[PDB]
């Protein structure tokens, strides 16, 4: 339904910080995240999870196949533990990112902001699809 969107990713997790974008700033290094399609095999939303491995946030977000792009509607509710996410600018690009091994991948790029980070910041989560080869793994 949004095939191409759903995925298996490993992403890294920067962030604006006085308005320098700083490189993985928690030393959070690679992490494992998932998108994938809603019970209903919706066509305009789908489940962005980043599997408790950073935030752990789990909701779900507006899509549009077309354009490869998905996003919510201002800070949305988190269904992994009470409180609210917000989405912007996401983006699926096919085989845009290059894997470790040398191999392109499809990239997956947004940004997000959680309504219970005293720091008000906005992160930038960019990644590529898992390819199941250990040597793409971390």
């Given at each position: 339904a949004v095939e191409k969107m759903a995925g298996?990713?490993?992403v890294?997790?920067?962030?604006?910080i006085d308005g320098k974008?700083?490189?993985?700033?928690?030393?959070a290094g690679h992490l494992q995240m998932s998108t994938?399609?809603?019970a209903s095999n919706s066509e305009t939303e789908m489940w962005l999870d980043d599997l408790g491995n950073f935030w752990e946030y789990k909701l779900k977000v507006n899509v549009n196949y077309?354009?490869?792009?998905?996003?919510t509607t201002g800070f949305v509710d988190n269904v992994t533990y009470e409180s609210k996410v917000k989405?912007?600018?996401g983006k699926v690009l096919e085989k845009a990112a290059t894997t470790p091994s040398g191999m392109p991948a499809d990239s997956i790029v947004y940004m997000v902001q959680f309504d219970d980070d005293e720091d008000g910041l906005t992160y930038k989560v960019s990644?590529?699809?898992r390819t199941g080869f250990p040597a793409d793994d971390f």
């Open positions: 298996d990713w490993w890294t997790v920067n962030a604006f974008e700083v490189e993985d700033p928690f030393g994938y399609n809603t077309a354009a490869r792009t998905f996003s989405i912007t600018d990644g590529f699809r």
